[PDB]
Design a protein around this nucleic acid. Sequence first.
RNA 1: GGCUCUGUUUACCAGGUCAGGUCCGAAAGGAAGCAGCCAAGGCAGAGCC
Length: 69
Amino acid sequence: FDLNDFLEQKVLVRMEAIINSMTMKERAKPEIIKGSRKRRIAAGSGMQVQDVNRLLKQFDDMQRMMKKM
RNA sequence: GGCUCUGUUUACCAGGUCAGGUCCGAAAGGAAGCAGCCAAGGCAGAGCC
Ligand SMILES: [Cl-]
Ligand SMILES: [K+]
Ligand SMILES: [K+]
């Protein structure tokens, strides 16, 4: 389960925007998204770093639920 | 070495464009700009000088 699958799942549009700012490698392997990548994605989606942190955490909550079932 | 062709490769960190999204504006309209793409660079093979 990756961010390409989470994309297919005003608040919903803003979340899709953050993923639209990522590279295919970032969508395929979300763990590589550290500080510098979060800043590029944030500014690129017109959001703040906190909004990227929230989206990545919401993905991690979903990924951990998919790993349980 | 140079030029060109071809393959491939490259998140941001002074190229272009810019879906999505963002910012300014009551509007009309403006602005910046990620990803992608183009271009460019990297690694090579080849042809020519
Ligand atoms: Cl080349
Ligand atoms: K761009
Ligand atoms: K650009």
